[PDB]
Amino acid sequence: PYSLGPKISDWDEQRRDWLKQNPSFPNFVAPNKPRVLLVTGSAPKPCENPVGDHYLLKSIKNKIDYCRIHGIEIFYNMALLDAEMAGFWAKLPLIRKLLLSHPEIEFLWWMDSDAMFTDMVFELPWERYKDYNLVMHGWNEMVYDQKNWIGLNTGSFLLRNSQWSLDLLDAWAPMGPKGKIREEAGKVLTRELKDRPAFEADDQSAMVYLLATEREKWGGKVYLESGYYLHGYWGILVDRYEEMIENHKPGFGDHRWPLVTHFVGCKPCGKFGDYPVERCLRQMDRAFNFGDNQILQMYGFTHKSLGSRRVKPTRNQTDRPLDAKDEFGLLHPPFKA
Amino acid sequence: PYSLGPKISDWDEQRRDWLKQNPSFPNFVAPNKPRVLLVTGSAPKPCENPVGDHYLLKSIKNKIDYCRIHGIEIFYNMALLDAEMAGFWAKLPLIRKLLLSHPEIEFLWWMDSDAMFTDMVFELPWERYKDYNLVMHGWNEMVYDQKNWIGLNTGSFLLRNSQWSLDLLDAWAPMGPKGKIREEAGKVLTRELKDRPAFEADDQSAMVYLLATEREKWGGKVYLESGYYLHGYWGILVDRYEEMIENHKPGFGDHRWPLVTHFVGCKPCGKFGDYPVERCLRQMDRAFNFGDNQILQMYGFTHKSLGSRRVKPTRNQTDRPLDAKDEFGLLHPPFKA
Ligand SMILES: OC[C@H]1O[C@@H](O[C@H]2[C@H](O)[C@@H](O)[C@H](O[C@H]3[C@H](O)[C@@H](O)[C@H](O[C@H]4[C@H](O)[C@@H](O)[C@H](O[C@H]5[C@H](O)[C@@H](O)[C@H](O[C@H]6[C@H](O)[C@@H](O)[C@H](O)O[C@@H]6CO)O[C@@H]5CO)O[C@@H]4CO)O[C@@H]3CO)O[C@@H]2CO)[C@H](O)[C@@H](O)[C@@H]1O
Ligand SMILES: O=c1ccn([C@@H]2O[C@H](COP(=O)(O)OP(=O)(O)O)[C@@H](O)[C@H]2O)c(=O)[nH]1
Ligand SMILES: O=c1ccn([C@@H]2O[C@H](COP(=O)(O)OP(=O)(O)O)[C@@H](O)[C@H]2O)c(=O)[nH]1
Ligand SMILES: [Mn+2]
Ligand SMILES: [Mn+2]
């Protein structure tokens, strides 16, 4: 029987004592700002199609820029800690190890390599989650009522460092072990969940199943967020970037300017995906430039067009660089107190 | 005539006034710890060599880990800000823009994309440079007396945010503009420098030519460091990694455990390097694993060998993860207090 590790039951007590002992590493970097670690990664070998690595590179730069502006540290995993938890399941052993290794972390923010920040201004409403331990983009009706396999998304979520999360991780991993375990589990998920195709068990479907069947146990501390695009399905967003630039401005994080554009199904690192490769890559270029225009804007540049690698100035240079106006206050934001 | 921008003559005064008006953004994050922005970059298009992008990805993860440990922020540039300053000259306009845009930065630490951290413990001796504005790996005699084009290295250097640095950039760019200017200046460098082959002018050779021919004006504020490998020629390091693991420990930063392994001449991304690609890439894998071992060992893992992507546990899991601090205290080091 697979296990993520030796059972721990007093983790909240171990954290409490550790923080008391090490006040130089508080779990809240500011009155209402918890210490956050964004976690991502990818397989340690080159992508089967070579350009896949290039889009992982653009992806990590994108996360670097957002995290530098919002004062959150990054960890990029390139190792498989548990041979039985490969693929999308590999983030469960990783998350557990980082939680136990960094008790100063209050929230762990996992983000897929195919997800990209498209709103550089938007800051997460931390106080909205002060009484919850797991935050995912989704809808209650889709998860608990319809049991729809896309009622939530596990490519961008927050997990609080607590005993509740360690147990949640244990209740989530059983369908992960590669082979017959994961295959037979997929048959269950396709049968019990709505609209789910037939394939091996994935971490997202397992979360829906767990929450739909054990709501009394977990639902109280799970926050299904649908007010902003903590996760944003690319298939309905990338085409509207021009409309967003024309009518709106960064900071909304929702349908007016999504926080995250997640390219579910594109698989730029594998050989085939669920969508045309041409559309996937061209729209990944557009999403990257959509977010990168907000970075270059601080420095007086912008991409010639949303699909061009080339940039152009947005204003003449000056011998008085400190008088310029930072439109969205990202050069010296309050997130870097 | 080429110019990096409108002439600024009172930057030291502008910066001081700004710092006084913005105490929340000090230029020293702690006593003798200057605020540092590490800056790297690569061309916006996929690598001519397809797998080259996979090694840019590994290189930036390596910098993420080191900078996370030592509390240093990262900027990853993918834009050609000035069409004339293409190639390795692209860092001059980038460095100027970042210094003028971030007055809170005391030191800008440029680092090549083919340069990798192999000592995760070593912290630069900042106090040693309290009176200097430019820090490069090199030797006085080889630069000033011999005029050797490799007497110093511009792939890993510290540049202080100051009027002096702005003036240096003005005196450094003339040989940059692509075309007749760079090609002609290349002939000047091959004729005036020792052992330089024949090719277009490069930023490193130009720096040597400048400092050797104008030592009185610039030399006083330049520190040519050779006590540790701020720049480490891979050719004399990668073969010794296993010896270092046996005999020494991370923290020395020099011949016993180099801070930076820099794969000059390899061109993992471009083409037509000075060394075989196979030998280059396989040693870059070893260099990455040499550094990555120091990261993974915080969490109880290590690479099976410097040539294997697989990892193995260094110790059994435990229900008391907060009793054994890491061997070098990098989980909670003083750089993040
Ligand atoms: O761009 C288009 C054109 O490119 C041309 O190709 C160029 C290429 O552009 C360029 O990037 C490349 O530049 C690198 C060379 O490829 C590379 O071989 C060279 O390696 C240097 C290394 O940089 C340097 O650090 C190292 O220095 C030694 C030094 O030799 C030695 O004296 C010294 O010894 C010390 C002892 O170790 C120490 O114990 C004692 O205390 O002090 C001694 C010194 O006093 O140790 C240092 C190392 O620490 O030497 C190696 C070998 O030279 O670095 C170059 C810069 O990155 O060059 C290519 C051309 O060759 C194409 O040719 C053209 O077609 C294209 O159009
Ligand atoms: O070996 C692996 C496989 C995947 N991932 C990460 O887990 C996420 C989700 O895995 P998935 O199989 O769903 O790939 P996706 O289609 O989301 O790109 C990936 O984006 C990667 O960021 C990883 O770190 N190591
Ligand atoms: O279009 C480009 C080409 C290069 N570089 C950067 O300039 C550096 C030049 O260093 P390189 O390794 O190519 O020269 P070498 O060290 O081999 O002599 C690269 O590493 C990149 O970091 C860049 O920013 N844009
Ligand atoms: Mn994904
Ligand atoms: Mn280099």
XYZ file of C-alpha atoms in Angstrom, chain B residues 6-322:
317
model
C 20.464 61.209 -23.204
C 23.427 62.327 -21.124
C 22.857 62.160 -17.360
C 25.411 63.947 -15.177
C 23.817 64.106 -11.696
C 22.743 60.505 -11.127
C 24.534 60.143 -7.782
C 22.506 63.121 -6.546
C 19.212 61.938 -8.058
C 19.665 58.504 -6.462
C 20.413 59.929 -3.009
C 17.328 62.156 -3.042
C 15.205 59.215 -4.214
C 16.502 56.903 -1.478
C 15.802 59.537 1.180
C 12.248 59.932 -0.154
C 11.679 56.142 -0.349
C 13.026 54.583 2.862
C 10.893 51.473 2.268
C 13.236 50.654 -0.662
C 16.740 50.892 0.825
C 19.881 50.129 -1.146
C 21.160 47.988 1.758
C 18.765 45.249 2.892
C 20.984 44.691 5.952
C 24.325 45.846 7.404
C 26.965 45.364 4.675
C 24.422 43.440 2.543
C 23.776 45.580 -0.558
C 20.605 45.082 -2.557
C 21.525 43.000 -5.612
C 19.652 42.336 -8.851
C 21.061 39.391 -10.784
C 20.500 39.918 -14.513
C 20.723 37.299 -17.264
C 19.092 36.811 -20.647
C 18.933 34.992 -23.957
C 17.673 35.577 -27.476
C 13.860 35.746 -27.829
C 13.802 32.994 -30.469
C 14.326 29.242 -30.009
C 17.905 28.030 -30.087
C 19.467 27.208 -33.442
C 20.534 24.021 -31.681
C 17.134 22.592 -30.656
C 18.257 21.099 -27.325
C 19.963 24.387 -26.454
C 16.703 25.606 -24.921
C 16.694 22.704 -22.454
C 20.051 23.912 -21.107
C 18.891 27.522 -20.862
C 16.013 26.149 -18.778
C 18.374 24.198 -16.517
C 20.645 27.242 -16.276
C 17.868 29.540 -15.060
C 16.585 26.998 -12.528
C 20.152 26.911 -11.198
C 20.162 30.697 -10.770
C 16.702 30.604 -9.167
C 17.993 28.235 -6.487
C 21.138 30.215 -5.654
C 19.339 33.569 -5.667
C 16.521 32.153 -3.529
C 19.049 30.980 -0.931
C 20.980 34.263 -0.853
C 18.006 36.635 -1.116
C 18.809 38.073 -4.544
C 16.195 39.069 -7.114
C 16.354 37.929 -10.735
C 15.604 39.665 -14.023
C 15.581 37.490 -17.155
C 15.683 39.579 -20.325
C 14.465 38.232 -23.666
C 14.153 41.553 -25.525
C 16.482 43.289 -27.975
C 16.127 46.841 -26.668
C 18.492 48.307 -29.292
C 18.706 46.856 -32.800
C 22.329 47.991 -33.158
C 23.482 46.313 -29.923
C 22.654 42.750 -30.924
C 24.265 39.607 -29.546
C 26.468 39.783 -26.458
C 26.377 43.592 -26.749
C 22.665 43.566 -25.837
C 23.483 43.684 -22.117
C 24.779 47.275 -22.178
C 21.403 48.928 -22.972
C 19.691 46.461 -20.629
C 22.037 47.242 -17.737
C 21.604 51.005 -18.154
C 17.802 50.804 -18.253
C 17.706 48.651 -15.115
C 20.079 50.904 -13.160
C 18.068 54.033 -13.983
C 14.738 52.268 -13.386
C 15.756 50.736 -10.021
C 17.634 53.321 -7.933
C 17.181 51.059 -4.897
C 19.623 48.589 -6.489
C 23.192 49.025 -5.269
C 24.837 46.269 -7.347
C 23.687 44.805 -10.653
C 25.104 41.284 -11.033
C 25.111 40.311 -14.696
C 25.525 36.581 -15.314
C 25.773 34.815 -18.668
C 23.204 32.172 -19.558
C 26.022 29.631 -20.057
C 27.260 30.393 -16.515
C 26.030 28.258 -13.631
C 26.318 28.349 -9.843
C 28.294 25.361 -8.544
C 28.795 26.618 -4.957
C 25.396 27.271 -3.367
C 26.876 28.164 0.046
C 29.399 30.818 -0.990
C 28.245 34.404 -0.415
C 30.160 37.133 -2.216
C 32.413 39.242 0.088
C 30.497 42.495 -0.321
C 32.531 44.492 2.212
C 35.641 43.751 0.140
C 34.089 45.874 -2.637
C 32.716 48.727 -0.499
C 34.996 51.210 -2.316
C 34.763 49.813 -5.868
C 32.143 50.101 -8.603
C 33.088 47.283 -11.017
C 34.038 43.760 -9.929
C 35.247 41.203 -12.471
C 37.243 37.993 -12.356
C 40.708 38.661 -13.722
C 44.311 39.616 -13.049
C 45.852 43.093 -13.045
C 49.017 42.029 -14.861
C 47.168 40.179 -17.631
C 44.854 43.143 -18.329
C 46.922 46.284 -17.796
C 50.406 44.995 -18.681
C 49.753 42.141 -21.134
C 46.477 43.451 -22.628
C 45.301 39.839 -22.842
C 41.751 39.576 -24.169
C 41.069 36.931 -21.483
C 42.712 38.831 -18.619
C 39.179 39.428 -17.330
C 35.695 38.049 -17.972
C 32.460 39.961 -18.589
C 30.133 36.978 -18.131
C 29.804 37.452 -14.359
C 30.438 40.886 -12.847
C 29.068 43.355 -10.309
C 28.346 46.940 -11.385
C 27.421 49.559 -8.804
C 24.459 51.847 -9.420
C 26.272 55.181 -9.720
C 27.201 57.996 -12.081
C 30.598 56.333 -12.505
C 28.895 53.242 -13.926
C 26.803 55.322 -16.339
C 30.003 56.922 -17.643
C 31.687 53.525 -18.013
C 28.770 52.311 -20.136
C 29.180 55.326 -22.429
C 32.884 54.522 -22.882
C 32.153 50.793 -23.348
C 29.490 50.913 -26.093
C 31.408 52.581 -28.985
C 32.646 49.242 -30.379
C 29.143 47.766 -30.114
C 26.974 48.895 -33.052
C 26.665 45.935 -35.411
C 28.022 46.261 -38.934
C 31.026 48.263 -40.108
C 31.586 49.713 -36.630
C 31.808 46.374 -34.820
C 33.724 44.617 -37.607
C 36.267 47.435 -37.909
C 36.633 47.692 -34.130
C 37.215 43.938 -34.213
C 40.327 44.441 -36.335
C 41.535 47.091 -33.879
C 41.144 44.676 -30.964
C 42.876 41.762 -32.704
C 45.808 44.092 -33.422
C 46.068 45.760 -29.996
C 45.265 42.824 -27.680
C 47.347 39.745 -26.919
C 46.267 36.391 -28.392
C 42.881 37.598 -29.692
C 41.649 35.708 -32.788
C 40.065 37.586 -35.705
C 36.341 38.274 -35.317
C 33.832 41.040 -34.649
C 34.382 43.284 -31.647
C 33.061 41.817 -28.400
C 32.194 43.401 -25.070
C 34.959 41.534 -23.223
C 37.789 42.542 -25.567
C 36.464 46.115 -25.618
C 36.548 46.258 -21.813
C 40.177 45.090 -21.820
C 41.089 47.689 -24.446
C 39.345 50.412 -22.428
C 40.849 49.581 -19.028
C 44.364 49.027 -20.394
C 44.433 52.240 -22.456
C 42.721 54.383 -19.788
C 43.787 52.872 -16.463
C 44.115 56.254 -14.742
C 40.472 57.144 -15.419
C 38.839 53.788 -14.618
C 41.293 51.447 -12.898
C 40.887 52.970 -9.446
C 37.265 51.806 -9.178
C 37.777 48.360 -10.774
C 38.467 45.299 -8.614
C 39.957 42.392 -10.578
C 39.096 39.422 -8.371
C 41.011 36.143 -8.479
C 40.590 34.724 -4.954
C 37.484 32.814 -6.041
C 35.785 31.827 -9.292
C 33.374 34.669 -9.874
C 34.045 33.397 -13.395
C 35.208 29.797 -13.677
C 36.589 28.485 -16.965
C 34.818 25.137 -17.330
C 37.796 23.588 -19.119
C 39.831 23.305 -15.905
C 36.975 22.575 -13.463
C 34.436 20.040 -14.746
C 36.915 17.146 -14.696
C 37.722 17.788 -11.010
C 34.179 17.723 -9.584
C 34.415 14.248 -8.052
C 37.751 15.148 -6.454
C 36.133 18.192 -4.831
C 33.266 16.113 -3.427
C 35.795 13.778 -1.804
C 38.322 16.309 -0.494
C 36.450 19.574 0.124
C 33.012 21.060 0.802
C 30.870 23.889 -0.589
C 31.759 27.319 0.751
C 35.270 27.879 -0.586
C 34.131 29.201 -3.971
C 37.632 28.760 -5.445
C 39.680 25.841 -6.823
C 38.282 23.629 -4.045
C 34.629 24.324 -4.960
C 34.080 26.870 -7.749
C 31.301 29.417 -7.342
C 30.624 29.690 -11.088
C 31.278 27.181 -13.857
C 31.102 29.135 -17.117
C 30.936 27.214 -20.395
C 32.677 29.810 -22.540
C 33.117 28.778 -26.163
C 30.435 26.067 -26.059
C 27.411 27.865 -27.543
C 24.780 25.363 -26.345
C 22.137 27.595 -27.964
C 23.832 28.957 -31.088
C 26.320 27.089 -33.270
C 29.985 26.963 -34.280
C 31.454 26.747 -30.800
C 35.124 26.256 -30.014
C 34.558 22.818 -28.436
C 32.567 19.710 -29.385
C 28.879 20.082 -28.573
C 28.684 16.561 -27.134
C 31.528 17.251 -24.700
C 30.047 20.640 -23.793
C 26.512 19.426 -23.087
C 27.568 16.337 -21.131
C 29.756 18.494 -18.876
C 26.950 21.046 -18.476
C 24.867 18.137 -17.177
C 27.616 17.366 -14.659
C 27.923 21.032 -13.661
C 24.157 21.315 -13.166
C 24.083 18.134 -11.074
C 27.115 19.310 -9.093
C 25.162 22.391 -8.043
C 21.769 20.687 -7.850
C 23.134 18.147 -5.351
C 23.569 20.968 -2.834
C 19.898 21.902 -3.291
C 18.477 18.372 -3.195
C 20.473 17.501 -0.074
C 18.480 20.030 1.958
C 15.442 17.814 1.302
C 17.082 14.402 1.722
C 17.959 13.557 -1.889
C 20.947 13.530 -4.218
C 21.749 12.559 -7.784
C 22.909 8.956 -8.111
C 25.915 10.356 -9.982
C 26.930 13.615 -11.621
C 25.920 11.998 -14.931
C 22.467 10.690 -13.932
C 19.176 12.583 -13.922
C 17.805 10.112 -11.363
C 17.959 10.949 -7.656
C 18.139 8.773 -4.555
C 17.343 9.455 -0.889
C 20.189 10.456 1.406
C 18.219 9.371 4.496
C 14.996 7.618 5.439
C 11.774 9.557 5.900
C 10.756 10.511 9.427
C 7.767 11.777 11.396
C 10.021 14.434 13.004
C 11.339 16.501 10.076
C 12.328 19.528 12.209
